[PDB]
Amino acid sequence: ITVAD
Amino acid sequence: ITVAD
Amino acid sequence: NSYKMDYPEMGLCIIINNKNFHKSTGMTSRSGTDVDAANLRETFRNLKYEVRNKNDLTREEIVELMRDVSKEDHSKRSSFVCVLLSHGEEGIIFGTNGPVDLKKITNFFRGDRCRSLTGKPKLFIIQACRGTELDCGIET
Amino acid sequence: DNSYKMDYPEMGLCIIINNKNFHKSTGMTSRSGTDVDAANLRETFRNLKYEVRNKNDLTREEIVELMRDVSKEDHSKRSSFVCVLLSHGEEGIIFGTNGPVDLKKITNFFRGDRCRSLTGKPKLFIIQACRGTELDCGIET
Amino acid sequence: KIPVEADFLYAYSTAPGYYSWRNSKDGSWFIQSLCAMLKQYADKLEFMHILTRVNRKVATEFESFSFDATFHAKKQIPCIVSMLTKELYFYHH
Amino acid sequence: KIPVEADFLYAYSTAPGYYSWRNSKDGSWFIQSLCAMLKQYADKLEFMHILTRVNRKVATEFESFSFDATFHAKKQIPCIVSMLTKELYFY
Numbered sequence: 001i002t003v004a005d
Numbered sequence: 006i007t008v009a010d
Numbered sequence: 011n012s013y014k015m016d017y018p019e020m021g022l023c024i025i026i027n028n029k030n031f032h033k034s035t036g037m038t039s040r041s042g043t044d045v046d047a048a049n050l051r052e053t054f055r056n057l058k059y060e061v062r063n064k065n066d067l068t069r070e071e072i073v074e075l076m077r078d079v080s081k082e083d084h085s086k087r088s089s090f091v092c093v094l095l096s097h098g099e100e101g102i103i104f105g106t107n108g109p110v111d112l113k114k115i116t117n118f119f120r121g122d123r124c125r126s127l128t129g130k131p132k133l134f135i136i137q138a139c140r141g142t143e144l145d146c147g148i149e150t
Numbered sequence: 151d152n153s154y155k156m157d158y159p160e161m162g163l164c165i166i167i168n169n170k171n172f173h174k175s176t177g178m179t180s181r182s183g184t185d186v187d188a189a190n191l192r193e194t195f196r197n198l199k200y201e202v203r204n205k206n207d208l209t210r211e212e213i214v215e216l217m218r219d220v221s222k223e224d225h226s227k228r229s230s231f232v233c234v235l236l237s238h239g240e241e242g243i244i245f246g247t248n249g250p251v252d253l254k255k256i257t258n259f260f261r262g263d264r265c266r267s268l269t270g271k272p273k274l275f276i277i278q279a280c281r282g283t284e285l286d287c288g289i290e291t
Numbered sequence: 292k293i294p295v296e297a298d299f300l301y302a303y304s305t306a307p308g309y310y311s312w313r314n315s316k317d318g319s320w321f322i323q324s325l326c327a328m329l330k331q332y333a334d335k336l337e338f339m340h341i342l343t344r345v346n347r348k349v350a351t352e353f354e355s356f357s358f359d360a361t362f363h364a365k366k367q368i369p370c371i372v373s374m375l376t377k378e379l380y381f382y383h384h
Numbered sequence: 385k386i387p388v389e390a391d392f393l394y395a396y397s398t399a400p401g402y403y404s405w406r407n408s409k410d411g412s413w414f415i416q417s418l419c420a421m422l423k424q425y426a427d428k429l430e431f432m433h434i435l436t437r438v439n440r441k442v443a444t445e446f447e448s449f450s451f452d453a454t455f456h457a458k459k460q461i462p463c464i465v466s467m468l469t470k471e472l473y474f475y
Contacts, residue, residue: 004362007406012379121295128298133300139309187411187412187415190416262388272393275395277394286399288457295459297439309389337433
């Protein structure tokens with residue numbers, strides 16, 4: 001659910 | 006007498 | 011001392027919210043960013059900023075928007091705020107169709123280029139990666 | 151807590167690396183006036199109760215070794231850490247007397263996983279050095 | 292006169308070189324925290340001190356959850372870059 | 385657990401990409417101003433606000449004097465880079 005930018 | 010660093 | 015914040019208007023808050031990218035960039039859609047933009051809209055509305063929300067801009071549209079905003083008359087505004095929500099790398103923010111250097115965006119608001127913001131605080135809030143390093147943290 | 155705990159027994163170390171004279175192989179002008187900076191810093195941080203350690207004209211390898219050694223000291227009884235770099239530089243780079251050193255290489259010895267007795271404590275790096283060759287002509291107000 | 296680069300503040304979500312993390316439902320850690328701290332403290336604290344509280348919130352309260360072990364259990368510190376010349380208070384009086 | 389890059393403060397004398405100026409007998413503009421503002425305010429202000437006064441002193445009171453026109457009448461703004469998580473008081 002955490003993704004990177 | 007101002008100089009660069 | 012402190013910036014004069016009692017001009018007639020707090021100033022502009024530009025929110026550039028890039029969610030959907032052309033897949034020739036190789037970048038994925040940024041789910042959740044709409045929640046960010048809405049939260050920012052409300053937060054800066056309570057601070058009395060005139061919030062302008064912009065969605066999925068190309069890098070040309072980013073450059074053109076920032077140029078146009080820098081050419082407005084900010085004489086009666088206390089400050090300027092710009093929020094960038096997108097993918098990025100060090101020094102770089104992505105439009106929907108590719109990257110643009112952050113320095114090109116911010117140079118429009120330099121003290122010699124945007125005279126009606128001279129001496130006034132210019133705040134850039136940047137939600138974007140700055141590289142691929144990972145912080146594994148440390149327990150205390 | 152909204153404020154760092156500053157009542158350890160010691161405020162901490164203040165490392166001052168003052169590079170005035172550079173190797174003839176570099177071709178770098180001597181940095182006149184830097185001694186005045188180092189002495190001002192020594193006195194200012196003495197009045198803040200830091201243990202000041204002045205270091206003069208270190209090579210790139212002496213800077214790294216000095217920083218490695220200090221980061222392996224026991225800072226458990228110290229409230230913070232201060233390092234001051236007075237030298238020539240470029241973006242992200244400080245110069246030893248004999249060539250460049252990555253700033254990241256210096257500060258990495260003090261990362262929260264590498265210097266455990268400074269975990270959670272303020273680590274301050276004060277860098278007097280150019281970061282490029284751009285010129286600010288200013289704007290009259 | 293003043294430098295042409297003065298009176299800029301760059302509030303970065305993450306340290307130079309690093310990934311920035313975003314919850315796919317709740318939004319980016321940094322913007323969530325920034326909005327929360329402004330709502331709580333915009334009428335009591337100077338902007339740098341608000342941003343320092345954002346730094347603490349992101350650093351302490353958030354850790355990544357990923358089905359891919361390479362991106363799991365990761366941490367983030369925001370990065371305040373200030374060329375401001377004065378304190379900035381949003382309220383008045 | 386905290387980030388390994390947390391709790392650093394980098395007080396740079398000048399903006400990214402730019403020269404940093406030094407007076408050949410009184411010292412660098414930045415260290416001069418930093419020591420002056422610490423002497424005057426370390427018993428009254430939080431560190432970030434002390435550095436903001438330093439920013440203002442360098443930005444407003446200093447301008448280069450050089451016999452070489454390329455380096456004359458130049459200006460400087462320091463650059464505070466804070467990964468701190470708390471306020472820092474020296475008192």
